[PDB]
């Protein structure tokens, strides 16, 4: 397998992605109170929205890049989900496919007792990775309900990142101490291991 550090990236992305699902990521996404965050010239639109249900939450394969000085990792956490908008004037259940990436920077740091840990630094959604598309068959939608997509663009990334970033932090603190130690030693000495 040499060089065995080649495997660390995959192990890290496995443990993190596993941690996310073990920690209830999908249900957490499903239970965001989107229509209430949005409620509490839009009053018409908003008044014609019976409810919103979030279904088919998805975690995609994680991306990982190591910084050029070797001290930091950047994890790309790609998410998908479907918004089910009950809006009767529309004639049908309105479905929106959502995509969003969260970027989490991972750092190594030693504690007051000398123990080394992986910790979350910056954590925030990736500019321009939010995608909201109305599911209408093989024919795309143009200029229908742009206001709804606009409000969603304003609220949805922030809700999602406010749920996902704390979850990532907790997972980091609970990782396998052996994996933590090996990766953190690499990071703290600025040593490259993630293959681009
Ligand atoms: Na090896
Ligand atoms: Na690796
Ligand atoms: Na390597
Ligand atoms: Na894998
Ligand atoms: Na749901
Ligand atoms: Na599902
Ligand atoms: Na750098
Ligand atoms: Na309606
Ligand atoms: Na639809
Ligand atoms: Na951001
Ligand atoms: Na995207």
Curated annotation (Swiss-Prot):
Q: Which UniProt keywords apply?
A: Antibiotic, Antimicrobial, Disulfide bond, Glycoprotein, Immunity, Innate immunity, Lipid-binding, Repeat, Secreted, Signal
Mind naming one GO cellular-component term on file for this protein?
Answer: extracellular space
Q: Which residues form a coiled coil?
A: none
Q: What coarse category fits the chief subcellular location reported for this protein?
A: secreted
Mind listing the GO biological process terms from this record?
antibacterial humoral response; innate immune response; multicellular organismal-level water homeostasis; negative regulation of single-species biofilm formation in or on host organism; regulation of sodium ion transmembrane transport; surfactant homeostasis
Q: In what tissue types does this protein appear?
A: Detected in airway epithelia (trachea and lung) and in bronchoalveolar fluid (at protein level). Upper airways, nasopharyngeal epithelium and thymus. Highest expression in the trachea and progressive decrease from proximal (bronchial) to distal (bronchiolar) airways. No expression is detected in the terminal bronchioles, respiratory bronchioles or lung alveoli.
Keyword Cell membrane among UniProt keywords: no
Query: Where is carbohydrate linked to this protein?
Result: 101, 147
Q: Where in the cell is it found?
A: Secreted
For this chain, the annotated S-S bridges are 123-165
Q: Which GO terms describe its molecular function?
A: lipid binding
* Quaternary structure and partners: Monomer. Interacts (via N-terminus) with SCNN1B, a subunit of the heterotrimeric epithelial sodium channel (ENaC); this inhibits proteolytic activation of ENaC.
Outline what the protein does: Lipid-binding protein which shows high specificity for the surfactant phospholipid dipalmitoylphosphatidylcholine (DPPC). Plays a role in the innate immune responses of the upper airways. Reduces the surface tension in secretions from airway epithelia and inhibits the formation of biofilm by pathogenic Gram-negative bacteria, such as P.aeruginosa and K.pneumoniae. Negatively regulates proteolytic cleavage of SCNN1G, an event that is required for activation of the epithelial sodium channel (ENaC), and thereby contributes to airway surface liquid homeostasis and proper clearance of mucus.
For this chain, the family text in UniProt reads: Belongs to the BPI/LBP/Plunc superfamily. Plunc family.
Write down what this protein is called.
Answer: BPI fold-containing family A member 1
> Which species does the entry assign this protein to?
Mus musculus
Instruction: Give the residues of the full protein shown.
Output: 65 to 277 of 278
